[PDB]
Amino acid sequence: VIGDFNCTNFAINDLNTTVISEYVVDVSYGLGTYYILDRVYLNTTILFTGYFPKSGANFRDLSLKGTTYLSTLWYQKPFLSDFNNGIFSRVKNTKLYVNKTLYSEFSTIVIGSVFINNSYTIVVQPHNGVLEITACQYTMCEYPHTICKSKGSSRNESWHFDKSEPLCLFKKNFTYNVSTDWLYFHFYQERGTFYAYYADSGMPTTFLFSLYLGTLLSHYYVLPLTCNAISSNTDNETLQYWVTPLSKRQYLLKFDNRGVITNAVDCS
């Protein structure tokens, strides 16, 4: 389980027939890199040490799409994952349509330790062009999940059950371009402070925020999304949420004559 609160008994089983899809990290076009502090480098190559993916390591696609039933096995290892120093995410923006109006969906991620309301859980959730980010003492469900608010779902949304508002260290919204095909994120921790970088356009990420927690984060989980759409019998659309571990690595970075990181090399 994530959490421990019994949010519902409705339509749960032990279905085993789901496996992690995997793909190979390739930073040669600047994927997995980020812009350095407030600096601009031009038409040059730099050696820099930062929280980066290992080149040639695997990404794991942790996105889960459901329709009605939830497997208990989705709420365990290998999906419930160790956070260590941090993670890099490559996220497909699943662009749906209703009456020729565009809607943007992708999986929520939660980052935490015990997921009990005596500890802070970070949550990053899309709301169709608004990225809502919070860090609160959420009463996380045993079996948390989200819904397609655009197309609808056979079950209600539930990932926490707080009746009164919980205590929060952080709560902000960031806009993102709903038309882009991919979002990139770095989430990492150093000396009890969490750091988030993202990009909605291009591959190199840029700083969103940092947050003092004092405590070590230890786990992350990508919430199942339940939808009446997003499948081969209705639209051929898919979720994808690729993650890979960060570590403190030395990279070569190449900046063009307008300060964009165009290429990188993991030196080991």
Ligand X SMILES: *[C@@H]1O[C@H](CO)[C@@H](O)[C@H](O)[C@H]1NC(C)=O
Ligand Y SMILES: *[C@@H]1O[C@H](CO)[C@@H](O[C@@H]2O[C@H](CO)[C@@H](O[C@@H]3O[C@H](CO[C@H]4O[C@H](CO)[C@@H](O)[C@H](O)[C@@H]4O)[C@@H](O)[C@H](O[C@H]4O[C@H](CO)[C@@H](O)[C@H](O)[C@@H]4O)[C@@H]3O)[C@H](O)[C@H]2NC(C)=O)[C@H](O)[C@H]1NC(C)=O
Ligand Z SMILES: *[C@@H]1O[C@H](CO)[C@@H](O[C@@H]2O[C@H](CO)[C@@H](O)[C@H](O)[C@H]2NC(C)=O)[C@H](O)[C@H]1NC(C)=O
Instruction: With contacts defined by CB under 6 A, name the span among 64-72, 126-134, 140-148, 233-241 that binds ligand Z.
Output: 126-134
Which 127-146 residues touch ligand Z, going by CB under 6 A?
127, 130, 132
- The reply on whether position 128 binds ligand X by CB under 6 A is no
Using CB under 6 A, which of 5, 59, 176, 185 touches ligand Y? 5
CA proximity to 240, closest of 31, 35, 44, 23: 23
Figure out which of the listed residues 28, 56, 78, 171 binds ligand Z, where binding follows CB under 6 A: 171
Q: How many residues bind ligand X (CB under 6 A)?
A: 18
| Contact call for residue 134 and ligand Y (CB under 6 A) | no
Task: Provide φ and ψ at 74, rounded to 5°.
Answer: -70, -15
Binding segment toward ligand Z, per CB under 6 A, in 26-34, 50-58, 124-132, 242-250: 124-132
Q: Which of 93, 94, 108, 139 binds ligand Y (CB under 6 A)?
A: 139
Residue 24 within binding range of ligand Z, rule CB under 6 A: no
Binding mask 18-57 for ligand X (x = CB under 6 A): -------------------------x--------------
Query: Residue 187 CB, nearest distance to ligand Y (Å)?
Result: 25
Per CB under 6 A, which of residues 162..181 are in contact with ligand Y? 162
Look up residue 260 and give its two tokens.
């964009």
Toward ligand X, which CB reaches closer, 155 or 219? 155
CA 156 to chain centre: 22
C-alpha–C-alpha distance, residues 243 and 50, integer Å: 17
Binding part of the chain for ligand X, among 92-100, 105-113, 124-132, 230-238 by CB under 6 A, reads: 230-238
Applying CB under 6 A, the residues found at the interface with ligand Z are: 127, 130, 132, 171, 173
